[PDB]
């Protein structure tokens, strides 16, 4: 009856020095029942990353839709979309549904291929943009995530330091959340390369 909490799931994103990280649990539940341990919530369109927590059907719908739109963007503009611009595309697409919105909480992460500057941003379900240079959290364990990040976070962490932080923050928060868990994924992103590690976590 609270659409944002039927399926569960979390996503967190952080910035470090010339890098960003984005992570999600792998759970898809139907309320108390765990259904899948492989429901990844992080997507990419070029070098821009999108995490989506909230109602699973809308997560899937939204991902297919930004695929479709970012493809068209490429065919016309002849380049890949950049995180700043894509954030705006996300915001305005969500607002198009202001009176019957998708029940999701997007998070954007990526490096600007021209400026090299690291970028993250978060939204509510109707598109308001939260741009911050530290961290963005979304999901059923968002308060947990907020508590963890606010304590664990330093600025300018090197990628492999940043990996430790973001992982510990996600992991420890999902563990205080009945609706998150069942696996985790972490993306470490630099303008050069992108690494994706699956995490070992409790399965209960």
């Amino acid at each position: 009856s609270d659409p944002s909490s039927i399926n569960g799931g979390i996503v967190v994103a952080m910035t470090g020095k010339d890098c960003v990280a984005i992570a999600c649990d792998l759970r898809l539940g139907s309320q108390s029942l765990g259904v899948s341990n492989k429901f990844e919530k992080i997507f990419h369109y070029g070098h821009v990353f999108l995490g989506i927590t909230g109602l699973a059907t809308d997560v899937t719908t939204l991902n297919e839709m930004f695929r479709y739109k970012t493809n068209l963007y490429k065919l016309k503009e002849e380049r890949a979309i950049e995180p700043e611009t894509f954030t705006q595309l996300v915001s305005s697409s969500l607002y198009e549904r202001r009176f019957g919105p998708y029940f999701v909480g997007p998070v954007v992460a990526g490096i600007n291929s021209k400026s090299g500057k690291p970028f993250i941003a978060g939204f509510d379900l109707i598109g308001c943009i939260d741009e911050a240079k530290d961290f963005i959290v979304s999901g059923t364990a968002s308060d947990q995530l907020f508590g963890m990040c606010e304590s664990l976070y330093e600025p300018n962490l090197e990628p492999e330091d940043l990996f430790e932080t973001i992982s510990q923050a996600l992991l420890n928060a999902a563990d205080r959340d009945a609706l998150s868990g069942w696996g985790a994924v972490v993306y470490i992103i630099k303008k050069d390369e992108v690494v994706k590690r699956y995490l070992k976590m409790r399965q209960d």
Binding site: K76, E77, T85, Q88, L89, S91, S92
Partner: peptide
């Protein structure tokens, strides 16, 4: 502007 939050590149406005 109302979709990407910036003004179109010159070729696109042209097309």
């Amino acid at each position: 502007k109302r979709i990407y939050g910036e003004y179109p590149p010159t070729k696109l406005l042209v097309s």
